[PDB]
Design a protein around this ligand. Sequence first.
Ligand SMILES: Nc1nc2c(ncn2[C@@H]2O[C@H](COP(=O)(O)OP(=O)(O)OP(=O)(O)O)[C@@H](O)[C@H]2O)c(=O)[nH]1
Ligand SMILES: Nc1nc2c(ncn2[C@@H]2O[C@H](COP(=O)(O)OP(=O)(O)O)[C@@H](O)[C@H]2O)c(=O)[nH]1
Ligand SMILES: Nc1ncnc2c1ncn2[C@@H]1O[C@H](COP(=O)(O)OP(=O)(O)O)[C@@H](O)[C@H]1O
Ligand SMILES: [Mg+2]
Lengths: 365, 376, 428, 427
Amino acid sequence: LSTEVVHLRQRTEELLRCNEQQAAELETCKEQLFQSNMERKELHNTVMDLRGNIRVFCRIRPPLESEENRMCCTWTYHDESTVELQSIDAQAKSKMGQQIFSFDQVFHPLSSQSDIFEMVSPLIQSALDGYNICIFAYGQTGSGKTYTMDGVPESVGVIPRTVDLLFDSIRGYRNLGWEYEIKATFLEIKNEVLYDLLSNEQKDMEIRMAKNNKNDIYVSNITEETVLDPNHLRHLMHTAKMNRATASTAGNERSSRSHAVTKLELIGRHAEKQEISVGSINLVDLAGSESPINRSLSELTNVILALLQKQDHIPYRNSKLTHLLMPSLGGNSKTLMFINVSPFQDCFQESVKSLRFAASVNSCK
Amino acid sequence: ALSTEVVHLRQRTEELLRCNEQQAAELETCKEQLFQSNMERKELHNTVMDLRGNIRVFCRIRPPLESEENRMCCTWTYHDESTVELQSIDAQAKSKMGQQIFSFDQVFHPLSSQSDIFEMVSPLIQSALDGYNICIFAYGQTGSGKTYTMDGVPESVGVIPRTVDLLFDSIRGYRNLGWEYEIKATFLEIKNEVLYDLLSNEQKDMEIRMAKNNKNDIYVSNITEETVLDPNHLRHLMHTAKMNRATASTAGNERSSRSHAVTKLELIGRHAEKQEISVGSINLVDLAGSESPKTSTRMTETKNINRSLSELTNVILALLQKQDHIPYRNSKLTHLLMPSLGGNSKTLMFINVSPFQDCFQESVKSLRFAASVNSC
Amino acid sequence: MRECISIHVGQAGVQIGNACWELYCLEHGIQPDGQMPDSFNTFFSETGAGKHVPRAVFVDLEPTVIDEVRTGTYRQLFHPEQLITGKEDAANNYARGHYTIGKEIIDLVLDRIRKLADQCTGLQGFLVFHSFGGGTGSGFTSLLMERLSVDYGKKSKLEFSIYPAPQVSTAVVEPYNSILTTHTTLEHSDCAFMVDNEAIYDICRRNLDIERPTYTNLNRLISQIVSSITASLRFDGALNVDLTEFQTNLVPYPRIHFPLATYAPVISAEKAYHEQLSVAEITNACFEPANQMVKCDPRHGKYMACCLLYRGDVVPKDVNAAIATIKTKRSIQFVDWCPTGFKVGINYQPPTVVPGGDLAKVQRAVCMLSNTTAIAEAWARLDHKFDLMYAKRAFVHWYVGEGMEEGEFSEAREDMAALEKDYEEVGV
Amino acid sequence: MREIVHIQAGQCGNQIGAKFWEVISDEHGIDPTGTYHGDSDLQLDRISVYYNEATGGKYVPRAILVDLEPGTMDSVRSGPFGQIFRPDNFVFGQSGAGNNWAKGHYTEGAELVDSVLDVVRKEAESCDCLQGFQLTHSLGGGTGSGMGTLLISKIREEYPDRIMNTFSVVPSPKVSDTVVEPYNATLSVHQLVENTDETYCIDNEALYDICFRTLKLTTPTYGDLNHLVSATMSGVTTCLRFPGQLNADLRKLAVNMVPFPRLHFFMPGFAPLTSRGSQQYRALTVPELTQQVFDAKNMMAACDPRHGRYLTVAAVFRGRMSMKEVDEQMLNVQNKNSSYFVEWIPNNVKTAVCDIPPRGLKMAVTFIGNSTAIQELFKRISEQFTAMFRRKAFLHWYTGEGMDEMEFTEAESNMNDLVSEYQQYQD
Ligand SMILES: Nc1nc2c(ncn2[C@@H]2O[C@H](COP(=O)(O)OP(=O)(O)OP(=O)(O)O)[C@@H](O)[C@H]2O)c(=O)[nH]1
Ligand SMILES: Nc1nc2c(ncn2[C@@H]2O[C@H](COP(=O)(O)OP(=O)(O)O)[C@@H](O)[C@H]2O)c(=O)[nH]1
Ligand SMILES: Nc1ncnc2c1ncn2[C@@H]1O[C@H](COP(=O)(O)OP(=O)(O)O)[C@@H](O)[C@H]1O
Ligand SMILES: [Mg+2]
């Protein structure tokens, strides 16, 4: 009986040695995984910068069933990045000159929601790289800004799609050591006043410089929930839209004029190493661009153009929305802009007002 | 304490065997992830190259000597790191040539040394680590610094010594990835539009022939291709070429400074576990001097030397303009380097210029067509 | 004696010189042998024996046309050692004529011209006749011009090159040779007179009324031009003007030295009877754009200078009246800074018509050496043709393979562009 | 004096060269013996370019006769103007290529190239300043292709400065005379695009059209067919052999014709082709020659130029004329046919007016057109070559001689690149 004891005595010794080398070899490859992952972060960021700026994106939406009897405009498509619109009124056709606008890409009414998410997928990685991102939906009332951001259950918007991609990478990144916590704040900018979409307990809210980063901004008293899974955030967004008090039935102006800011801060901490990231994505659904308050909308127009001019001073604190996005409008980060345009002659004067902003972007950048 | 040891160490066997299986399964997962992790940056990095380039033009101006700094030198003006302005001091040259401003990817100061060149080595070897046919070109006149940057000096080595050192330690990391890389050294010379061998003194007939596998893959028959085993062996391979390429360079300017040496290091990476084979090649190619042909003793082949440069200039312009057909076969150098010049392949374009006034005109010729690449 | 010599490179140069020296020996009663059965001393180095050897240096890279002149009636007229022959033509290439055959015979030609110069007592200048699209007439001509500028410099180098016609180019590679030779000759030619083949074709069409014009008639006209130019030296007149005064009177700046020639009395024998050939009418005729020897509209550009050479029974009062009337003309535009350039070359030696020619016996003849702004557009379109050739890099392989680089082509193109800039800033 | 060496490969090349030498002797008034009896001393001026001086005032052609079947030259030797050749020039094998380029380039070529190379050097050193070599052969058979491919490869590597004239007879598009002429032609053009720098493509089918329709001939004998080629080819060099207003040569047109080294395949054309009885109805002036020589009806090649663009046009003239007419008429066709001319080469016409016309004629024009219509001929051959390639038809005859199948891919691939350039430069 003593013979088998000796046989397992060396078996214990050899299994200790095999596992010790197995673990030691494992950690070397594991460290190689970390160094291989961090270079991919910069490459993704570099591509965005080499692409220039991810602003100047027009999305034309098709007329609805109730909009079949409305009169359209002459939409002229050029290649895939330039679009021209002309009024059917030939009397004004000779007086309009050149209503030509060139964009980074052009989306036509036949583009599905997944087409928009193609340019929204790469920035999600950039958000994971500790960089602040924003998505702006801009245009007149009825253009389709809410459909681009929120959409419908049949064709989900960017907000449902960003969460699915965000969590898919996070679980895959679990093999890469990093652990992430998702913080969701839902807020509405009605008129230079901040309203919480996650609580009915009306209080006063103020914006102050961050305690650990003077260039960063935190919102006081905001409800900041930890997102566990896409089911949790989907419930959180449902609460926000119900609490938003959608008065489109009676008094649509109140609901429309209010800006909708969705901020999703990503925090990444890596044990056994050093890693600090506060990258956030601000999915802001901007209000109507119709001519008349507009303090937030007008300042957002000026701040964006000033940044392209490399202006020495930016009036970030000139409005609540611009000051809310003061750290979300920096130089190192990358900005997106969606211009939703109604394909109607009655909106032709409003359509050109949505597009000359982009015409002033590329001419300034 | 014997019967109890039987059960306890049997439990230890299960505790370790479970750990054996626990570590084995995720060891495959971590190795599998690392392949795609390196594959993700593999397609991410060339995208960075594609947006900013895939035909990269770099200019370096060499510093004048202690006695040559007192020698007349054209004014050097650096608007930024990417644009350089050279102005002829002569008033008559100013009235006709005017302002000579040129735009490139990056401008090298005479005091930049080889630091930023080595900073360019890491992205370009990564493209080679991506299994891409990458080529570098050393264009310029005699004494402009082509030999100082390619081969280098003992105190500050050139690109060739730096590339070999960094390549060898790089593949050691991929040896931890289960990748076995076979690297092949090929040396050849293009003088008088006929190829020779640097590693062999025997006069053999060389001809350009497409490889059996693919038409786009090119080899040369009867070459002395050597399997590289270690750096010191590879270092000796390049060292053996110098004395075989022994000819007048500055004293007579007979064959050297008017010659095209092609140094191709074909890397063949293999992964036994995942049956994946990565095929790449680097082309450490230096170009002949672009001086106007004035040596009437042998001016006939200098035109062919100029023809290779002219055809190469025609080829690179064709790539930029998206020309359907590119005249690769008009010259031996372009035809041989066709795999590394078209498609996904990426070219560094390094030009050397001289700061002296007498070389201002030849410097202008170097800059304008190199800047023409950046324009398109 | 302020004697001068002439050079002939290219088939154009050789044919032109043949017709020219034929006219010359006709002027002074010189037989084809070389004797006359002083005035002629300028171009003829007459020895003690009756052999008035011409001061001509005929050079060609192929022996065909030189053998032809060695076969014609003037073989014994010319000194046999003067005629320098190559073996292979420059073949439309500035490259060949400037690098591959040019320097392989330039030693012999320079030795011959130096021997001629030491023969001359008082050297006046140099005359060269060539083409632009011609490989020899570009490469060899530019190499010889720079060589003579190095050797002498102070002497007068005069070019009688022929312009490439605006609508027809016999050589498909004319723009390359033209641009290269202009770049390499701009700083080595004192003054380069211009003549165009298409313009003289139109002139002999509508004025000579000849339906079958050959190169012989063009050479006759060019010989008349050169005879008018050299009459002031070969003969006495009221106001003799030599080649030295030409650079003073004509060129305002060193770069702008491209005047164009014109010949007014170009009527035929039949039309001679219907006209009296007065000084005023021929003076007006020489200002007609249709009578210009270069295909351009002088009405579209201002004039820089006007050198007038009169020969025959002409009165200075008539010339003064004609120029005064022209000063009052509207279409004749001028620049303000030089409002008095009308230097006259009045002479009383009537031109002589060759037997079997197309010109008529005219009492008085005038040779208009106009310098005007009307060549800027011609240079612009020549540079445009060069850019069209260079954009696709067509034919560049030959030149880069026989003596140059495309960088040098860029240098020549930008030099022509700078010349255009200087021309247009002078014009305003 | 810019002498030219003549080489004839294949029986077709031998017959064409015999016709060419007989018409040249007609130009210079040379009997079968070699005694000169002409009247114009201009013949003696450039008699050296084709005839070597011989004792007793005789002359011999500077020609090399190469073949693998001895019988062909026996007819040439027995026929008129056969003894005019120096007998040492007759170099031949005994086996015979048998319409197989495999034999003519690797086995029979290797054993015989040395025999012809030495006599080439002997003739080459018998000259003052050599101008170039003219090769007469065909792309159909093996002797005319195996010899030519080897010789042009050989001659180039020791005479790089010289120019190469290859008078290759391109296979007919429809009336095929060889089951495997795609194999000969495709392998032939591989060496052509690498070594020579000017090639004249001639098609018998189009040549049949010239005699049957333009000349309204009824008996298209090869003697008549070769006569047109011989007359066309002599006009190419008349500017070199005779004086004129613009004395050109092969060097003159060499730079003019080819914008790029590879695009050196041209369409010959001879203007004066009045029928047996139509000469009375037709006046003979510069005009009629101009439009007649610019017709697809008159092209020696079987390609319609209207399908492509004239990259470069040459026009060599013979006889007495005023160059003003040729000036504006070349300008005239340059305007009316602007679609047929490449846009980025304005005024793409070369004129080489000579003085002496052909005997029995007053004016003559030789047309050398480097149009882009050639690519339709190559794709026809490319389609025919690839039709019989993957089915491996007759492959054993070529493969069994000692060449790899990938070599067939080289010729197919390289010639495909030649095709791709034409349509690229067509736009
Ligand atoms: N006006 C005029 N021009 C002529 C005459 N003969 C030749 N030319 C011009 O001369 C040019 C011919 O080229 P050349 O000057 O002879 O040059 P080349 O010696 O033949 O050398 P390549 O041009 O390379 O062949 C043509 O473009 C004609 O315009 C002539 O008799 N009168
Ligand atoms: N014009 C002409 N063409 C010929 C003559 N004889 C043969 N050919 C052509 O040449 C081809 C024959 O191939 P060839 O080269 O002569 O065979 P090889 O000598 O054995 O190589 C055929 O396609 C014919 O079209 C001839 O007398 N005149
Ligand atoms: N591509 C589309 N297909 C169908 N309906 C759309 C589309 N885009 C927008 N809509 C309609 O627009 C409405 C959304 O209103 P929207 O125009 O986004 O408000 P806002 O004026 O704030 O942008 C939805 O009810 C939807 O039916
Ligand atoms: Mg909305």
